[PDB]
Amino acid sequence: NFQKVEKIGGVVYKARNKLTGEVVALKKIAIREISLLKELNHPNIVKLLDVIHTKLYLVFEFLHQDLKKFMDASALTGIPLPLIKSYLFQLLQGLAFCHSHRVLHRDLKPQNLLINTEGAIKLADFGTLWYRAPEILLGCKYYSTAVDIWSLGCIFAEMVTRRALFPGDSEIDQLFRIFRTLGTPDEVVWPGVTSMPDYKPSFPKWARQDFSKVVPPLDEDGRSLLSQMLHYDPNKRISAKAALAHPFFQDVTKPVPH
Numbered sequence: 001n002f003q004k005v006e007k008i009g010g011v012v013y014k015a016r017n018k019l020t021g022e023v024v025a026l027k028k029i030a031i032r033e034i035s036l037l038k039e040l041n042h043p044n045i046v047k048l049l050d051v052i053h054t055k056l057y058l059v060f061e062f063l064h065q066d067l068k069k070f071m072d073a074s075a076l077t078g079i080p081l082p083l084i085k086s087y088l089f090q091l092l093q094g095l096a097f098c099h100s101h102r103v104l105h106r107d108l109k110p111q112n113l114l115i116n117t118e119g120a121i122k123l124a125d126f127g128t129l130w131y132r133a134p135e136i137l138l139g140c141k142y143y144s145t146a147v148d149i150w151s152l153g154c155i156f157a158e159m160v161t162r163r164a165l166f167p168g169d170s171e172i173d174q175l176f177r178i179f180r181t182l183g184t185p186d187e188v189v190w191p192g193v194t195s196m197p198d199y200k201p202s203f204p205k206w207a208r209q210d211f212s213k214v215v216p217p218l219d220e221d222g223r224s225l226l227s228q229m230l231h232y233d234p235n236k237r238i239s240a241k242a243a244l245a246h247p248f249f250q251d252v253t254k255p256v257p258h
């Protein structure tokens with residue numbers, strides 16, 4: 001039925017549908033979540049074409065490559081700001097759509113963001129440590145859409161600087177890397193943080209970095225938006241919908257990537 005072409009990322013393969021000649025991404029691995037997922041159409045969400053239960057196989061549209069590869073390829077010169085802005089804007093549209101339908105992504109990272117030759121970018125693999133929100137790291141079981149905004153913020157910073165923002169090697173290292181940059185959170189900035197399941201009063205108390213240093217040479221509009229995406233308190237973190245109205249996107253366009 002499907003011929004595997006190569007492994008590209010459960011497990012995901014490039015494959016040919018012999019019944020249609022279509023080239024697809026085939027993921028080899030509750031039904032309600034998938035239903036909701038399947039019914040969604042948006043230009044910035046990878047389309048789920050078919051679900052085959054026999055092991056569960058999810059058949060997705062196939063896209064050119066992922067943003068990780070593009071960023072590695074662009075590491076020498078960087079991604080031009082207009083393209084960064086376009087990608088961020090598009091990802092926020094996708095998230096705004098998902099979130100309005102009560103769908104969380106929860107594992108956003110460059111490897112899960114797929115691009116095409118025409119300037120589009122799409123969200124894929126709906127649910128490393130590097131893009132995990134602090135509330136998840138502190139043991140929150142009942143987290144919100146805000147976890148996706150944190151992750152996208154980390155990705156935004158990485159596109160700009162050509163370095164991962166918080167490349168932890170363990171959950172505690174991840175948390176402490178966050179704390180060393182943004183300051184150790186307290187009840188003032190994050191009411192309720194000290195009652196979180198894995199919060200320990202013995203966490204070292206670091207001061208916040210002046211931030212100027214975190215994503216140079218991003219302009220103040222960009223820094224403003226990023227800071228709103230990285231608020232500790234998930235309830236203060238900007239929503240995708242509001243982020244779309246941020247002045248950073250006043251001059252947004254849709255360039256064609258190299």
Ligand SMILES: O=C(O)[C@H]1CSC(c2ccc3cccc(O)c3n2)=N1
Pocket residue numbers: 008009012025027046060061062063064065066111114124125126
């Ligand atoms: O994990 C997933 O849900 C699936 C959605 S499609 C996808 C995927 C994952 C990696 C890919 C790499 C190159 C080109 C692609 O189309 C890729 N597609 N992963």
Ligand SMILES: O=C(O)[C@H]1CSC(c2ccc3cccc(O)c3n2)=N1
Pocket residue numbers: 182183184185186189206207208227230231232233
């Ligand atoms: O979550 C936020 O929006 C930011 C607002 S500033 C802030 C913060 C969080 C923790 C801090 C710890 C020591 C010194 C500081 O200035 C700190 N600042 N968190």
